[PDB]
């Protein structure tokens, strides 16, 4: 059991690992294009 | 087990380490360009 409990342990580390990356990369590109579009809106004007 | 539990221990330290940096650098540059664009919007006017 403790054996498989340790087994469940990397499970948590999976979500951790996996979804940490989720965060990381998601916001990354998010920021990126945001700024690209900022440059877009700097050449002219955002226009609401 | 406790051995591999210690093993899971740096796992947490990984996300910690890794994603701490995520934070750090992300917001860093975030702030940076924000300010660059502030200078952009200071020369003229943000224009909504």
- Strand percentage of chain A lies at under 5%
Number of β-strand runs of chain A? 0
Count of alpha and pi helical runs of chain A = 1
General shape of chain A: rod-shaped
Oligomerization state of this entry?
part of a larger assembly
Instruction: Give the helix level of chain A as a range of percent.
Output: over 70%
Task: Spell the H/E element sequence of chain A.
Answer: H
Taking the sheet with the most strands of chain A, its summary is:
none
Subcellular location (chains A, B): Virion
Family (chains A, B): Belongs to the p22likevirus portal protein family.
Protein name (chains A, B): Portal protein
Structural notes for this entry:
The structure is cut from a larger assembly and holds 2 copies of chain A (48 residues). Chain A has 48 residues and is an all-alpha fold. Chain A contains 1 helix and no strands. The first copy, chain A, has one helix spanning 2-43. Chain A is rod-shaped and about 65 Å long. The interface between A and B is medium-sized, with 21 and 21 residues. Chains A, B: This is Portal protein.
SSE topology sketch:
This is part of a larger assembly, with two copies of chain A (48 residues).
Chain A: H1 2-43
Family (chains A, B): Belongs to the p22likevirus portal protein family.
Protein name (chains A, B): Portal protein
Subcellular location (chains A, B): Virion
């Amino acid at each position: 059991d403790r054996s498989e409990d340790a087994r469940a342990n990397a499970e948590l580390l999976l979500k951790g690992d996996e979804q940490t990356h989720k965060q990381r990369m998601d916001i990354a590109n998010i920021l990126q294009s945001q700024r690209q579009n900022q440059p877009s809106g700097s050449v002219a004007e955002t226009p609401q």
